[PDB]
Homo-oligomer: A and B are copies of this chain.
Amino acid sequence: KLGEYQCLADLNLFDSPECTRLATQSASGRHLWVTSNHQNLAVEVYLCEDDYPGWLSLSDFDSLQPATVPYQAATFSESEIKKLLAEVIAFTQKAMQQSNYYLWGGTVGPNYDCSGLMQAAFASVGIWLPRDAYQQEGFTQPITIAELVAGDLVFFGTSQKATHVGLYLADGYYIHSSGKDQGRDGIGIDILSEQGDAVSLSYYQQLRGAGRVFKSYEPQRR
């Protein structure tokens, strides 16, 4: 009906009431807000942890249970975050070991989009990032490429905005989920170098910058 619910299964959220294009996916156990905006056979919702808005098919209403404990965002210091980056990296490596392909809106796994993998990996330690690559760029602390260290985000796109993101490892290497056209159609490792393979070179030429995660997302007031 209306108000705060928790997901009993992984739910697809679409970017319109027609449910033709996946916007994000809400993992089991996440909290979401159900609005009174019903249209077509869907209802407008937003996810509590990242404020992500979208449309949920009314057929997924049976997978919503009313929340009895409201979502309250946890606060992380920079040092707490640093301690958890090993787990974030490990998440991406475990993900790379599963059969996977690049899926726009892919967020619950095994099939991710670039920013979905970043969100899923940080959320595996309880750290919330916004969902889209351009939002992740705005949310992190910009750093120079020289300053990159394991667990930082690397951003790519045009001079206009970030449209791709990966997770830095070491000495130029980063892990990312990349598309079928220019990339690997799934999770893989590339290098920020002109000495890389063709894929690495396609991305390196689009490199925009780098960001450090210094806090977890706090939802907007409401």
Nearest B residue to A189 via CB reads B97
The answer to whether A108 has its CB under 8 Å from any CB of chain B is no
A93 vs B171: C-alpha distance in the bound complex, in angstroms?
11
| Chain multiplicity (copies) | 2
A83 vs B149: C-alpha distance in the bound complex, in angstroms?
12
**Judging by beta carbons under 8 Å apart, are B173 and A93 in contact?**
yes
**Judging by beta carbons under 8 Å apart, are A94 and B173 in contact?**
yes
Give the size category of A's interface with B. Answer: 20 to 34
Task: Give the segment of A43-51, A84-92, A126-134 that binds chain B.
Answer: A84-92
The answer to whether A170 has its CB under 8 Å from any CB of chain B is yes
**Judging by beta carbons under 8 Å apart, are B90 and A88 in contact?**
no
A94 vs B173: C-alpha distance in the bound complex, in angstroms?
7
**Judging by beta carbons under 8 Å apart, are B94 and A93 in contact?**
no
A149 vs B83: C-alpha distance in the bound complex, in angstroms?
12
Nearest Cβ distance between residue A92 and chain B, in whole angstroms? 9
The answer to whether A82 has its CB under 8 Å from any CB of chain B is yes
The answer to whether A106 has its CB under 8 Å from any CB of chain B is no
* Residues in B whose Cβ lies below 8 Å from that of A73: none
Chain A 137-175 against B: per-residue CB contact (8 Å), 1 yes, 0 no?
A: 000000000000111000000000000000011110101
Interface residues in A71-114 (C-beta closer than 8 Å to B)? 79, 82-83, 85-91, 93-94, 97
**Judging by beta carbons under 8 Å apart, are B90 and A173 in contact?**
yes
A94-B171, A94-B173, A97-B173 known, 11 other contacts, Cβ within 8 Å: A79-B83, A82-B86, A83-B83, A85-B86, A86-B89, A87-B170, A89-B150, A90-B169, A93-B173, A97-B191, A124-B170
Which residues of chain A have a CB within 8 Å of any CB of chain B? 79, 82-83, 85-91, 93-94, 97, 124, 149-151, 168-171, 173, 175, 189, 191
29 sampled A-B residue pairs with Cβ under 8 A: A82-B83, A82-B86, A83-B83, A85-B85, A85-B86, A86-B88, A86-B89, A86-B149, A86-B150, A86-B151, A87-B149, A87-B170, A89-B89, A89-B93, A89-B150, A90-B150, A90-B168, A90-B169, A90-B170, A90-B173, A91-B170, A93-B169, A93-B170, A93-B173, A93-B189, A94-B169, A94-B170, A94-B171, A97-B173
